[PDB]
Amino acid sequence: SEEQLNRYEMYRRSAFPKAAIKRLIQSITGTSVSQNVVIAMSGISKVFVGEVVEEALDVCEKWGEMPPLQPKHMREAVRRLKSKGQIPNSKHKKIIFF
Amino acid sequence: RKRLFSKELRCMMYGFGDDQNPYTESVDILEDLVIEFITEMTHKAMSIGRQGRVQVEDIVFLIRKDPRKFARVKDLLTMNEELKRAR
């Protein structure tokens, strides 16, 4: 239609800027990264945003609300993703044997 | 901290079906997920392989967790060479 073509345009053309993530990663490493790191790390974070919004619209469709996304559907989105291990936290030393 | 992903993330939520005008407190949430996702995939990437940040260990975490992040990183590494072959 005429909205699906505009939505497909924003699904492809949108990206995080490489001039800021290379500034953001290098503040964590200390020295330097490469261009093929920033190209991949800018691409995984678009999949991760698409992992949340496609699942936060499943929270909103499950409850009785409309397309505008309140934060109620966004804290619930991170809760359901973390219970399936999708959201990694490297500060919780987990233990499976008890 | 200011918001470094305020205008970029509004295009992306529209790209996955949200609205043309998302709420400010919803982009407040998604901007903090991405900064933690890049932190909790760099803090764990500087212990694997070596104490640097080569991209041969960024591709390790994407398998056995979610195959969409792996099938969309093999496309960005293949298309880097088909966009330098055209020049």
Binding site: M10, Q70, P71 | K7, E8, C11, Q20, N21, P22, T24
Partner: peptide, 26 residues
């Protein structure tokens, strides 16, 4: 020179269509 000016035109239309009014929520 063609790659330098056309890169910012994919993002310039990404500030005219999406996000016209800024909302909030209780």
């Amino acid at each position: 020179v063609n790659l330098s000016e056309e890169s910012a035109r994919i993002l310039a239309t990404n500030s005219e269509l999406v996000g016209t009014l800024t909302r909030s929520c209780k």
